[PDB]
Amino acid sequence: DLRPNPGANKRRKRVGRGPGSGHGKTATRGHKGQKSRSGGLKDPRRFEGGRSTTLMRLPKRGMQGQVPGEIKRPRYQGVNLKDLARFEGEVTPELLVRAGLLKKGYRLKILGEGEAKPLKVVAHAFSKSALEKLKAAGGEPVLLEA
Amino acid sequence: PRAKTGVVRRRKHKKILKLAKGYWGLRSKSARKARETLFAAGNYAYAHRKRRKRDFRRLWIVRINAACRQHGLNYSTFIHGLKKAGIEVDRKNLADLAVREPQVFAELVERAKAAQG
Amino acid sequence: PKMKTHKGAKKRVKITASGKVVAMKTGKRHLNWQKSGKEIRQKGRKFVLAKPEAERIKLLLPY
Amino acid sequence: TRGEVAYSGRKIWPQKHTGRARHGDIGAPIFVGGGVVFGPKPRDYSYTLPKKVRKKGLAMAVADRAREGKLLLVEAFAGVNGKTKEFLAWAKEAGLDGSESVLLVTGNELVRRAARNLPWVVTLAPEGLNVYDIVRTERLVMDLDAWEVFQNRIG
RNA sequence: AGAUGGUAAGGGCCCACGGUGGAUGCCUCGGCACCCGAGCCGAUGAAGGACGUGGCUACCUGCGAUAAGCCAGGGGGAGCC
RNA sequence: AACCUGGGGAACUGAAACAUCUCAGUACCCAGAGGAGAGGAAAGAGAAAUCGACUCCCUGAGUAGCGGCGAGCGAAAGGG
RNA sequence: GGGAAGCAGCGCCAGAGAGGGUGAAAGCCCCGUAGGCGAAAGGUGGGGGGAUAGGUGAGGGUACCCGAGUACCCCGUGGUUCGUGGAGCCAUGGGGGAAUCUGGGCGGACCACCGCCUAAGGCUAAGUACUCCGGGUGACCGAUAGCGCACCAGUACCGUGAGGGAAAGGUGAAAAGAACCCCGGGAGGGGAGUGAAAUAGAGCCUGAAACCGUGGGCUUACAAGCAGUCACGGCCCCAAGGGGUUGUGGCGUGCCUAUUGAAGCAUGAGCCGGCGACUCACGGUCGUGGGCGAGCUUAAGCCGUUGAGGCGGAGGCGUAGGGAAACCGAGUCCGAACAGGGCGCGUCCGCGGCCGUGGACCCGAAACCGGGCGA
RNA sequence: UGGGGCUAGGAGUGAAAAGCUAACCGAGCCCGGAGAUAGCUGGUUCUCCCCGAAAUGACUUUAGGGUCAGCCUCAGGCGC
RNA sequence: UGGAGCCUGGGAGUGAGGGCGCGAGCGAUAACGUCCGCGUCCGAGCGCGGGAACAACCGAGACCGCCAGCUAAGGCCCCC
RNA sequence: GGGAUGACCCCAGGCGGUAGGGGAGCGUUCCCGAUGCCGAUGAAGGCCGACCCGCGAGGGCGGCUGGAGGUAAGGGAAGUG
Secondary structure (H helix, E strand, O other), X not given: OOOOXXXXXXXOOOOOOOXXXXXXXXXXXXXXXXXXXXXXXXXXXXXXOOOOOOOOOOOOOOOOOOOOOOOOOOOOEEEEHHHHOOOOOEEOOOOOOOOOOOOOOOOEEXXXXXXXXXXXXXXXXXXXXXXXXXXXXXXXXXXXXX | XXXXXXXXXXXXXXXXXXXXXXXXXXXXXXXXXXXXXXXXXXXXXXXXXHHHHHHHHHHHHHHHHHHHHOOOOOHHHHHHHHHHOOOOOOHHHXXXXXXXXXXXXXXXXXXHHHOOO | OOOOOOHHHHOOOEEOOOOOEEEXXXXXXXXXXXXXXXXXXXXXXXXXXXXXXXXXXXXXXXX | OOOOOOOOOOOOOOOOOOOOOOOOOOOOOOOOOOOOOOOOOOOOOOOOOOHHHHHHHHHHHHHHHHHHOOEEEOOOOOOOOOOHHHHHHHXXXXXXXXXXXXXXXXXXXXXXXXXXXXXXXXXXXXXXXXXXXXXXXXXXXXXXXXXXXXXXXXX
């Protein structure tokens, strides 16, 4: 192919918007024409009036942490058996991170939705619902951390 | 890359000054006094083409009246006559007949007072 | 460079799956003395409109 | 910027009843001496393009060329021992008179040494194939080792 | 009884040729940025200076009362002061 | 010339007033080191039947927390 | 052709067609480039070799030693994300004041369990920081730019002093820089002569605008105006059409800003030239051109290139939501409740609009604080 | 009255005016913090095409400044 | 079937109004005065015609060109 | 509406405009295109025109001046009017 018309197709539009002229965006620069449009304005998102935000609403979302910090406890990642539907043989955590799901987010909890499938599934937890559906052939390798 | 002014400014400037030849004093020298002058000159022209169409309306009518008043009647009357007489013609422009071939103007006046008396 | 989350919003308003902004009805931390059981009973959470688009913008990174 | 400028900070004149206009110091950008407003500063223009999109192109590049009928991959380099004369001759036997430009890709140092100085040759090892070079030339010539490491660069 | 022509002290518009002035373009022993390399000196008197130094010498440069330079080793080959 | 460690150490400003708070251990002053300086071989980290001097980069993370719970400030472990 | 390096005929080298120079535009004319060489002397130098100094076991018994105004407690403060807080740890001005491994400190008040570490003496390359100095590069500047300075600049010049701080580059390929004559005290000119060119003749390339002259055409001394425009008519210059000028007639309240409203007797501007104001980084959010898709994507670094690209999954977003939380999960929370009710069906790069943090469109105060300089 | 000395910036000196402290002192000059901040005043540069506002309400140490609503615009969807 | 309408989202400016008519308050059945309410025009149509001159009274919503024709308010003795 | 979609022919409407929103273009500097193309039989820049093409910003053409540089089609950055 030639060097003419590698031309970026259809929409590149590098045309930024310059306001120095008598056509388009004049004197004032396409916006402005007053005062406090001049080097800064207070926010908004959160600010202003000088009034009372809407920091008038309270934090009943209480229980918010004391000095030495958060507590390190075990955390559980879910995965609907509908997703297990693909791959076959024996499913084990870590074999799940080596794939779209789980990754390091620690203890596996299989649960939930979609038709089950006949195979052994190693986990730390299942929901009520999920464990039953695995009755039509399957596994309860559970507990672990041992 | 810097992109200094370069040649550009001069060229927008004398584009205009050519447009300004022969206005009085600083209005053909200064590349901004000239601009201000040219603005009004523009508007003046637009307004005045409009006006031309009117300035000759007056002329044609002023001398038709002179001419047909020379046969007895007046302009008001003469035009009404032609209207009824069915001659969608004259076209005030083309009543220069009053000056060239008054023989034939005379004829038209008869037709006119025909429908009028 | 790089935004900081508005700690006093995080501390008081959770944000839903749809993107709505949800918090606790104002007006009951010493109002009481005698108001209807109806009044103080009626404190679960709620929507806010237009003004949550602002709230949200401040919980940038965490979502 | 008006701070990187040499001058002192003093207030050039009073501000008030002087008759002149109001001014700061002379490092200000309305000052011909001055600092410069939104001027360039040293900066990095590079960005991480999707590695996938790099592969596609490299491949799409060689294809077009082969479609033209302009790709030719070879083996027999009789024009060897790093001498322009030799290659010159070999190239005419292959049908390369210097009427089109050539991306000559090979792992062979000595064949690379031989060309180079021809204006109609851009020489290059197999590791550094890249779509720019491919396109800016008219005809492409590969060693077989070179065509190998090109297949491994895809899949 | 009558009539539109006719003068330029000076002035205005246009055209031509000069004067002043130093824009434009082209030019670059200079600058700016990044990357590499290299990194202390001084009582055995530093860094920084003053005065002095040529047949003739204002300044710059180099030298220090042995003062545009003294000794030796290495490099180079026809011109130097 | 900067660059480094120690001893001292502001205010304008921000908080749409201001006093705690912020700018900031910044600007600046002083002493000392060197081609670098500082640090450095566990009276350590912190929850792992764990790691294994010190410095430096990427993550961790605007997270855990601190805060007239305001304006705002902001870690460490762990992994590369 | 003033001059060849252009154009034309016929050749040659290339591990060298980077670049610069020569009277214009040259691989092969000059200096270079690829490639390859070289130190008597001084610096540097485990990178590679050698030599010392120094250091390497096990049991069983005594219980002699293991860093003092110290640990430790109390009072007053600092460091840390920690602003008195449930306030630990690390440091310490004041008061009291130990023990030597059955010794002592730590794991966020404290007690008990279970563990981690040995305070009160010291040294220790490398990975990292910076750029006065030397070299290489540039979708960096090109004399109002770029350093304050391309030029004899921290100079002239200003200030008692600390300190402030400019302007100012260019004949020609070659000086061949105009002998000699003529007017003039000179300075200038006029001939002559050099040169391709001398309105290239020396603060000399090109030489734009304001501004000042001379010459020529049209035009004006009974008029009156934001200075122009429309229409006729006369004169002057190449031809049934144009250009220049303007006698008479028609019509007409400067530009900008600011404003309810300006020709306004409201702001700014003597005129010309050159300088002069919406940016960049990192987050964010819509939109959009692509890649791949239930997945998409790499950071620092490592290997190549010397204008080549590869590798590198720590990490990040997404695949499930509710709840302060314990937690449960296609549900979950308030509730005694198989009442009701609330929430609950993509990513990477490019491009463009807007937001946050940084002066963040550009010029401007009165002042505040620090270190110095002045009787 | 000549010559030689001493005292300084919240400091000196003052037969007392807030006088004097290097030609403007109700707190000197120089450099730095620094491009302080400035809800205020001024300025903002090529061309054509289509649409085209507001000067109201609520709260505001608010009143010539703001935040939400209202009125302008573009894109997608819906269709009397 | 309209530069109508409704829904979701990206970008604004405006938050100083003024005159006229009609309906009230304040004022003195004063003010180019001042407060609200309904409408209009200027603002942004100081573009054009009428009104001697003149943002908002009457006529009328200006893509360009023509030495053609009909009208509107207002006019037809001369200036015209 | 034709519909051989031809971006060309036919018909019918809209086109005053400040703050603003949206759409198209023109020009300045630099990079790829380039070991190329133009160039002393004259580059850039400068001075004139009543001529040609564009709605316009602009772009061609011709004449004089100038004496060594300039750089298409199609794209990319910004100290861009």
